[PDB]
Amino acid sequence: KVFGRCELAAAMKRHGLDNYRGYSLGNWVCAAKFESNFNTQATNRNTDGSTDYGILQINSRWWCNDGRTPGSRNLCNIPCSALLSSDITASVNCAKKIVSDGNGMNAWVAWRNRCKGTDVQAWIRGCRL
Ligand code: NA
Ligand SMILES: [Os+3]
16 A cells, blocks of 8 residues: 555554654654655565565564564564555554664664654645644
8 A cells, every 4th residue: 555645644643653752743754755655565675684564664673573584583573564564553563662662763764864853744744633
């Protein structure tokens, strides 16, 4: 599923990401834009042999099991395929554990490089939320 920008803002808000660990909704929408282009099916291989999965590009090194990432953890206790559903529930629940782990949203390289320090609330402007 390729979400609309405001469609994703509404789904992320419904799941309680707005101001989760102090991160306003625009931070999460900006992260999803630059991680996955709002595409729940997005998959991208990392240099270390792990892969990033779904709308928020959650990594198999720590968070999910994809059956091909040796010596990795599965701290969200899920198959990585669960992160590719049109339903973002599993991605959001796992993202709440990630952002609570001490790194905040620095866990997402695209957020650090393309959202952090910017007018992130632009990503929710025009939306009925
Ligand atoms: Na893993
Ligand atoms: Os708000």
